[PDB]
Amino acid sequence: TFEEQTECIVNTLLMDFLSPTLQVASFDVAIIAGRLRMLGDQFNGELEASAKNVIAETIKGQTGAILQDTVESLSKTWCAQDSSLAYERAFLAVSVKLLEYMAHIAPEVVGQVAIPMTGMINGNQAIREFIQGQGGWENLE
Predict the structure, then answer these.
(1) Which of 12, 83, 88, 126 could form an SS bridge with 29, CB 3.0 to 4.6 Å?
(2) Which structural domain, as residue segments, surrounds residue 68?
(3) Which conformational region is residue 77 in: left (phi greater than 0), alpha (psi within -120 to 50 degrees), or beta?
(4) Closest Cα to residue 123, out of 60, 64, 39?
């Protein structure tokens, strides 16, 4: 169910970025999506170098490797300059803001990052335990 909830949330976030018509026209994903976007907007680091590399490897069919390494790198960098910020919360924030930027910069190919990012979050134990420890997706933020 948690794995399915992650899929819906990433779909909702992506659908909202690409089609604001669908957002308006259409476990409440809408409220969760909103809170993740609010958390995503707290990141102000450079994403141009990051987004381009992730997109490049996504086309080539090697999203898995670079995607987690990119999010982990930007999350560690942010946690080093923000002692208050938890690593697990930083990881989600960067993932949502990177998904946002990649949609604006590359709307044609961004959809091929949806499945990898879902697999990354579901596959990561540190991030999964943190989300469920906060009462799950429903209560996160």
Answers:
(1) 12
(2) 2-139
(3) alpha
(4) 64
